[PDB]
Write an enzyme that holds these catalytic residues in place. Structure first.
Site, PDB file in Angstrom:
ATOM      1  N   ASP A   1     -20.558  38.654 -27.771  1.00 22.49           N
ATOM      2  CA  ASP A   1     -21.027  39.709 -26.870  1.00 22.49           C
ATOM      3  C   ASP A   1     -22.130  39.127 -26.000  1.00 22.49           C
ATOM      4  O   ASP A   1     -22.998  38.454 -26.519  1.00 22.49           O
ATOM      5  CB  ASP A   1     -21.566  40.916 -27.678  1.00 22.49           C
TER       6      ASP A   1
ATOM      7  N   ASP B   1     -14.780  37.936 -35.760  1.00 21.04           N
ATOM      8  CA  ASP B   1     -13.502  37.465 -35.218  1.00 21.04           C
ATOM      9  C   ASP B   1     -13.654  36.226 -34.332  1.00 21.04           C
ATOM     10  O   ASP B   1     -12.681  35.790 -33.718  1.00 21.04           O
ATOM     11  CB  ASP B   1     -12.763  38.613 -34.468  1.00 21.04           C
TER      12      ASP B   1
ATOM     13  N   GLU C   1     -28.199  47.881 -26.991  1.00 16.69           N
ATOM     14  CA  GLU C   1     -27.273  46.745 -27.119  1.00 16.69           C
ATOM     15  C   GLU C   1     -27.989  45.396 -27.027  1.00 16.69           C
ATOM     16  O   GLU C   1     -27.607  44.438 -27.708  1.00 16.69           O
ATOM     17  CB  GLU C   1     -26.183  46.823 -26.059  1.00 16.69           C
TER      18      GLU C   1
END
Ligand code: NA
Length: 129
Positions: A52, A48, A35
């Site tokens: 993160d 959107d 990640e």
């Protein structure tokens, strides 16, 4: 801060992630690797408009407040900047709430796609734990 693999594994264990909701330590190290590449300062913007954040790439739409995601919830009750700290406590504490919501570790796209169903124990092999 960019963690070492074994150094991250020991901090996650200390914070109670080894076997948290049935997910062995190897899953959390694998997820953090794919990640954020073990970097607490990692940030990525989504289509959107959400963002993160941190070592576990926690999304601003539901979990944290970054003051720029309209109509977003702050379910972990923290500023998203707290998730970029060299101290992983806020990231770990928020991750425990996410993994408990019902979807397990499937909430992390990179875990589902690159860790799920693999030998995740390899991520902690050779570590003094
Ligand atoms: Na939010």
């Amino acid at each position: 801060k960019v963690f070492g693999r074994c150094e991250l594994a020991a901090a996650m264990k200390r914070h109670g992630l080894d076997n948290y909701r049935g997910y062995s330590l190897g899953n959390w190290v694998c997820a953090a690797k794919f990640e954020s590449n073990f970097n607490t300062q990692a940030t990525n913007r989504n289509t959107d408009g959400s963002t993160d954040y941190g070592i576990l790439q926690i999304n601003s739409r539901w979990w944290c407040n970054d003051g720029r995601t309209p109509g977003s919830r702050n379910l972990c009750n923290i500023p998203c900047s707290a998730l970029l700290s060299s101290d992983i406590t806020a990231s770990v504490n928020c991750a425990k709430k996410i993994v408990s919501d019902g979807n397990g570790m499937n909430a992390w796209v990179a875990w589902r796609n690159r860790c799920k169903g693999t030998d995740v124990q390899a991520w902690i092999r050779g570590c003094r734990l």
